[PDB]
Amino acid sequence: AKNRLGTKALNFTYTLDSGVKGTLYQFPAEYTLLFINNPGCHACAEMIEGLKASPVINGFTAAKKLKVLSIYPDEELDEWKKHRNDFAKEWTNGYDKELVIKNKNLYDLRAIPTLYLLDKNKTVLLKDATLQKVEQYLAE
Q: How many CB atoms lie within 10 A of CB 21?
C-alpha cells in the first residue's frame, strides 16, 4: 500500500560498508526510524545533525527502543563511502546495492531526505515526517 500510514513498509535489502547484507524486515527494533538520504546534499547534512542533537530521539536510542536505519538509494557508492562517517556510528547505515528501491519504485524518492517511523512489525507510524513530527509523536 505504498508505505501508507498503518500498512507495512516495503521491504528491501541493504548493504553495509563492511559488505554485510540485511533487510528491513530482518531489522530488530521496537521503533525503526528509516532515514532515506543522499548525503550529497545540505538538507541531508542538517537532518543528520538534527537527529544527533534531538533530546527526544536520543532518549529513545539510549533506552534501546529506537534504531536508525539509514538507506542510500542512488548510484554514487564512492561518495556515500565518502560521507559514511557523517552518520552516527550507532546507526545502521546502508546502501541499496541493486538499486531496487528506485527500479521497483518502492519508496517515493522525490523529496529525500525523508523519514519514516515504523513499529516493531514495520507498520508505518509516520510517513515522510519531519524530524519535529517524529519528536512530537515519540514524546506523546
A: 11
Residue 105: other Cβ atoms inside 10 A? 11
DSSP state of 14: E
Instruction: Give whole-number Cα distances, 100 to 45, 71, 86, in Å.
Output: 24, 12, 24
Return the C-alpha cell found at 6: 498503518
In DSSP terms, 69 is beta-bridged to: 34, 92
Q: Domain 1-140, what fold?
A: Glutaredoxin (3.40.30)
For residue 42, what is its C-alpha cell?
Answer: 545540505
Which H/E stretch holds residue 53?
helix 42-53
Way the structure was solved: X-ray
Instruction: Give the resolution in Å.
Output: 1.3
Distance, in Å, from the CA atom of 136 to the CA atom of 140, rounded to the nearest integer, reads 6
